[PDB]
Amino acid sequence: ATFEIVNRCSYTVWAAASKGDAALDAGGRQLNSGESWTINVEPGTKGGKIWARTDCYFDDSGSGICKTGDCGGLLRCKRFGRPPTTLAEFSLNQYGKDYIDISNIKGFNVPMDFSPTTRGCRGVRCAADIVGQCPAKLKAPGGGCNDACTVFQTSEYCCTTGKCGPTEYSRFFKRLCPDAFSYVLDKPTTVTCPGSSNYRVTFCPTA
């Protein structure tokens, strides 16, 4: 499957793509404002994620740091990124269908649209100014808006027991972005697409 990753932000981002225990494609790349990077993701990929990283520095070997979404200091991510990270999430070719969503469960750093480029389903978007409107207690000094689990480490926010409800914090993310997961047991906003669809992830789709 192809994913075209497009940076419409006025700032550089370092895109990342991983399934948690391995890179997808090269795993990461710099995208200046306006740049597009197309990656190939193997059919059947389960639990894949794409995200943006901000304010990164890498040496000539591809080792460094990002202020949001850092994946063990690598340019080419093999693992998931450090919150806060707006997440484009997907599982492909699962009994004949693809499943896509956007999640704020690990916080929000950069606005995103995640849409099919092929027929048969709709896209999802979280493009509100979540960083600007972020509750004081969730603001990440390093940049972005943390989820409450990251900040407070409670069973209720982290849904550790599989028994949690919505919270004042989850409701903030849900109010700003109804079409993204705001906590683990949120009413799903997952979209079912034809198996083997192709996609575009656009950072800063509205600005």
Domain ranges of the chain: 1-207
Place of tokens 């100014």: 129
The token pair at 141 is 């000094």
Segment 74-77 long-range contacts (CB within 8 Å, at least 24 positions apart): 74/27, 74/28, 75/14, 75/28, 75/29, 75/30, 76/23, 76/26, 76/27, 76/28, 76/29, 77/16, 77/17, 77/18, 77/23, 77/27, 77/28
Q: Could you give the CA distance from residue 84 to residue 66 in angstroms, rounded to a whole number?
A: 11
In the block, tokens 């740049």 appear at 35
HSE-up of 159 (CA within 13 Å, CB side)? 15
For residue 205, the SS3 value is: coil
Are 191 and 179 a contacting pair, CB within 8 Å? no
Q: Is 112 exposed, middle or buried (CB count within 10 Å of its CB: 0-12, 13-18, 19+)?
A: buried
Angle (nearest 5°) at CA 74 between 73 and 80: 85
DSSP character at residue 138: G
CA distance linking residue 149 with residue 170, whole number of Å: 10
Q: Any residues with CB less than 8 A from the CB of 203 and at least 6 apart, and which?
A: 5, 6, 7, 8, 9, 13, 15, 31, 52, 110, 111, 112
Instruction: Give the DSSP H/E element, type plus range, for residue 16.
Output: strand 13-18
Q: How do 2-7 and 199-203 pair as beta strands? A: parallel
Q: Which CATH class is domain 1-207?
A: mainly beta
Residue 2 CB burial class (10 angstroms; 0-12, 13-18, ≥19): middle
